[PDB]
Amino acid sequence: SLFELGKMILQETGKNPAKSYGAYGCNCGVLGRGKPKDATDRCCYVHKCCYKKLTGCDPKKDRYSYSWKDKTIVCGENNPCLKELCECDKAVAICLRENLGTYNKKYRYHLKPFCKKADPC
Amino acid sequence: SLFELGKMILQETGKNPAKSYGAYGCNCGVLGRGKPKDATDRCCYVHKCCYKKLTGCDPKKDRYSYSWKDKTIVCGENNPCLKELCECDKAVAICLRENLGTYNKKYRYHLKPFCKKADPC
């Protein structure tokens, strides 16, 4: 769920997930995707395409288990959808840390109508 | 959808809905409900209970038609669910404006474990 997603982002980035990534660019936050503004936004773009592949679970509300082992997110779920879901959130959190170097606050609270439509995943 | 909701909030409050309400208190822009921290937070509590009453449509994704007539949000649906959904979103947008007077930025990115159990809808 968003709880695990936010927690992972916190663990990887060190950043408050809601403030930094609850509404950034065209892909991080509510609504769907859009043409990404930067690398950080593209992580969320990939993340939402990753969500699309999931069936049998709810990426927003369904909680799942993972552990923080050797400072690495280790998804601990047998159930395929939850396991894939975990790996989706793990990927974006890793991706966000990797591109924190070009994070730009100007993209926070970016408005959707000023995002160009996304290509399909 | 969340797009129409966001637009209403902007139209009513004049505020970027993400910055002001994307994470406020225990009910605004956060997963689940919690005891409202203030009046603005209470708007979002009511809004989520409002959503819960809906049968037949999806609050987050289902688009609906409304208009801005004489600086008033005017829903434009006959379908009961889409109509009620629109009114749900309309009411929270208005509620948020009517409570800007006690809006407090300390409730932004509010820590969930400070939230007590919400009353039932």
Please name the method used to determine this structure: X-ray
Q: Determine whether the interchain pair B31/A112 forms a contact, defined as Cβ–Cβ distance below 8 Å.
A: no
**Torsion (CA) B105, B93, B17, A120 in degrees, nearest 10:** 150
Assess A23–B contact: CB distance below 8 Å, yes or no. yes
Distance separating the N- and C-terminal Cα atoms of chain A? 21
Q: How many whole angstroms separate alpha carbon B18 and alpha carbon B40?
A: 14
Q: Are A27 and A33 in contact (CB under 8 A)?
A: yes
Assess B31–A contact: CB distance below 8 Å, yes or no. yes
Q: Provide the resolution (angstroms).
A: 2.1
SS3 A91: helix
Which uninterrupted H or E stretch holds B1? none
Domains and their CATH numbers in chain A: 1-121 (1.20.90.10)
Is A47 catalytic? The answer is yes
Q: Are B75 and B83 in contact (CB under 8 A)?
A: yes
Q: How far is CA A91 from CA A12, A57, A60, B41, B48, in A?
A: 10, 18, 16, 32, 30
3-state secondary structure B53-100: HCCCCCCCCCCCCEEECCCCEEECCCCHHHHHHHHHHHHHHHHHHHCH
Is A54 exposed, middle or buried (CB count within 10 Å of its CB: 0-12, 13-18, 19+)? Answer: middle
